Amino acid sequence: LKGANASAPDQLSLALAWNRVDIARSQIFIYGQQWPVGSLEQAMLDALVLDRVDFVKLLIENGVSMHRFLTISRLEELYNTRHGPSNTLYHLVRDVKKGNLPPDYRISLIDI
Amino acid sequence: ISKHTQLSPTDAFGTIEFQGGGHSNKAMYVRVSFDTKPDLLLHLMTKEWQLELPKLLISVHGGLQNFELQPKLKQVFGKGLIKAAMTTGAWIFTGGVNTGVIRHVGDALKDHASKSRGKICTIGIAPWGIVENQEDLIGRDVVRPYQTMSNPMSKLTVLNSMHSHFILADNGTTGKYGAEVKLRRQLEKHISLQKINTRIGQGVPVVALIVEGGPNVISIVLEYLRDTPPVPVVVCDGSGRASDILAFGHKYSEVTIQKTFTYTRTQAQHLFIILMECMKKKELITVFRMGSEGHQDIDLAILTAL
Amino acid sequence: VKSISNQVWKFQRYQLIMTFHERPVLPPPLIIFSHMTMIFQHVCRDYGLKLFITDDELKKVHDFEEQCIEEYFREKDDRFNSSNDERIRVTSERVENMSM
C-alpha cells in the first residue's frame, strides 16, 4: 500500500480486489483522506458487482448514500454484470422473451 | 455593520434525517436569534419537543480544532460519559458541529446505540453560519434529507449526526463563531435555577467536563468557577492541550520555569494570573486519571463531583 | 397427522372467509333474482380485503416496523452473545492468548 504511493482510489481498489476489509478499515480510511469527488460512488459500484458485502457496508458507513448513488443506468449496469457467481437470470429472460433475443443481448429494466 | 440585521421570522424548524451515515437517525432542529430569552427556549424544549426537566445537566467543552485522542482513553471516556447520561436522565450540551470533542462524543453515542437501548437527549447548540448547507433545511415543519458527507475545502463543517436535538443561533455572519456562547451559558443558568422534583429545595445540578480545548478553555473554566453557585469541573489529563496544564497545576499547588509550554504563542505572554486563580479555587476542580489516582471510571468521576 | 391437519385448517380459514366474502347475499334456492341483476347492470373491498390508510398513518406504521426490526436484531445478537457455547469459545481463546 505505502509502497505504491498512489491515490486513495487505487489503494481502495487494491484492497477490494484482495478481499481484505480490515486493511482498508485501518490503513485506508484515516484522518483526512481527501477523497476525490466521485471516487466513493465508483468504488461502491465496483464493490457491488464483485459481491463484497463487507466493503459495501464499509462504504455505506463512510458517507456513501444509496439514495444518490443508485440511478437507472447504474441499476441497468448491475443487471448486466459478469464478474460474479453463476445465476439463472438469463435463462428466465430467454424463456419470457421466447428465445427471440440475439446473442449478447442487452437486458433492460422492462425485461426484468 | 453594527449588527444591522432585520428580525425576520424563523423559516427553518422541523425534523431532519441524516442520509449517508451508517444509521437512520432523526433530529429536531430550530434556528433562533442570539437574543432569545432562556425561558422561551426552555418552553420550546419542554413543550414542542416533549422533554421533561432533567435530573442532571452536563456541559461539554473542547477545542474546535480536530484533535486526536490516544487509544484506551477515548473508549473509557466515551463509555463513562454514556453510562453517566444513561443511568440517570440527563442532557448533554455540546457544540453541535462535527469538530474536535463533539466528534468524539458522536462516536461514543455511535458505540452506545450499537449495543444498548434507550435514547440519550443530547442537545447541540451550534451557530447557524458554520453549517455546510444553510439551505436544504428551510422546509418549515417538514422533513429535510441531509448529507453526512463532508469535504475539506467546504470551510463549513457539517452538523454531527447521533444528536437528538439541535438549536441554531444566528447573528448574521457566516464562517465566524461566538454567536451562541452567551445564549448557552444563560440557558444553563436558567436550567440550574429550575427546581428539581424533590421538595428539599435544590435545583438541577450542573457539571462541566473539559477535554483538550485551547486558550479559551481556561477562561471558560474560570468563568464557571467564579459564578456565585459554583459549578464543579472535571478534566481529563491525557488530551494533551490546556487540560494537561490544568492537571499539572492541580499537582504541587499552594515551578514557573516549568510553565514554558509555548503551545499558544510566544513565551513573553502568559495567562499565569488566571491559572493561579484556577489553582486558588482548586477544591471544586476534580481531575480524572487512569491508575494515578482514584475514580478510574469517568461515570464515577462525574457523579462524585456533583 | 393431527398437527398437519390443524395447520392446514388454520391455513384454509382464509380461503373460506374470502369465498364467503365474494358470495352474493341470497342463498342458492332463491339466487335467481340476483342472478339476473348483473345482466341489466352489465349494459348500464373497503374492508374484508384491504385497508386504505392515509399518509400519516403510513409513516407511523413504517417507523413502528423499523423500531420492531431493530429491536429484533438487537435481541438476537444479545441472546447469541450470552449463550454457553460463545462464552466457552471466547474464554478458551482469551485464556490461550493470556497463557502465551
| Bridge partners for C27 per DSSP | none
> How many angstroms away from the CA of B114 is the closest CA of chain C?
8
Nearest CA in chain C to B113: C74
C-alpha cell at B209: 467536563
Chain A interface includes B268 (CB < 8 A):
no
Scanning chain B, the segments in alpha helix (DSSP H) are: 38-47, 74-87, 101-114, 181-193, 215-226, 242-250, 272-280, 298-305
Query: How far apart (Å, rounded) are the C-alpha atoms in residues B183 and B306?
Result: 23
Burial C4-36 (b: 16+ CB within 10 A, else e): eeeeeeeeeeeeeeeeeeeeeeeeeeeeeeeee
Q: Supply angle C-alpha B136, B137, B142, rounded to 5.
A: 120
Nearest CA in chain C to B116: C74
Query: How far apart (Å, rounded) are the C-alpha atoms in residues A19 and B15?
Result: 39
Q: Which of B20, B151, B152 sits opposite A65 (nearest CB)?
A: B20
Q: Are B29 and B169 in contact (CB under 8 A)?
A: no
Helix (H) or strand (E) holding C95: helix C84-99
CA nearest to B299, candidates B58, B112, B84, B72: B84
CA nearest to B302, candidates B207, B203, B231, B204: B207
Query: For the purposes of burial, counting CB atoms within 10 Å of the CB of B148, is it exposed (0-12), middle (13-18) or buried (19 or more)?
Result: buried
Query: How far apart (Å, rounded) are the C-alpha atoms in residues A105 and A107?
Result: 6
Instruction: Give the CA-trace dihedral at B131, B132, B138, B143, to 10 degrees.
Output: -100
CA nearest to B29, candidates B106, B131, B124: B124
CA nearest to B148, candidates B4, B287, B20: B20
Query: How far apart (Å, rounded) are the C-alpha atoms in residues C95 and C85?
Result: 15
Nearest CA in chain A to B22: A61
Q: Supply angle C-alpha C21, C27, C30, rounded to 5.
A: 140
Query: How far apart (Å, rounded) are the C-alpha atoms in residues A80 and A87?
Result: 11
| Bridge partners for B15 per DSSP | B28, B143
Query: How far apart (Å, rounded) are the C-alpha atoms in residues A3 and B194?
Result: 61
Query: How far apart (Å, rounded) are the C-alpha atoms in residues B59 and C90?
Result: 39
Query: How far apart (Å, rounded) are the C-alpha atoms in residues B29 and B229?
Result: 31
Query: How far apart (Å, rounded) are the C-alpha atoms in residues A63 and B126?
Result: 22
Q: Do B24 and C74 touch (CB under 8 A)?
A: no
> How many angstroms away from the CA of A60 is the closest CA of chain B?
6
Resolution of the experimental model, in Å, one decimal? 3.7
Residues of A in Cβ contact (< 8 Å) with B150:
63
3-state percent breakdown (helix, strand, coil) of chain B, nearest 5 = 30, 20, 50
Instruction: State which approach was used to obtain the coordinates.
Output: cryo-EM
Query: How far apart (Å, rounded) are the C-alpha atoms in residues C41 and C47?
Result: 24
- Whole-Å CA distances, B61 to B50, B184, B218: 26, 11, 11
Q: Which residue has the cell 422534583?
A: B197
Q: Do A64 and B68 touch (CB under 8 A)?
A: no
Conformational region of residue B103, where left means phi above 0, alpha means psi within -120 to 50, and beta covers everything else: alpha
Chain B interface includes C66 (CB < 8 A):
yes
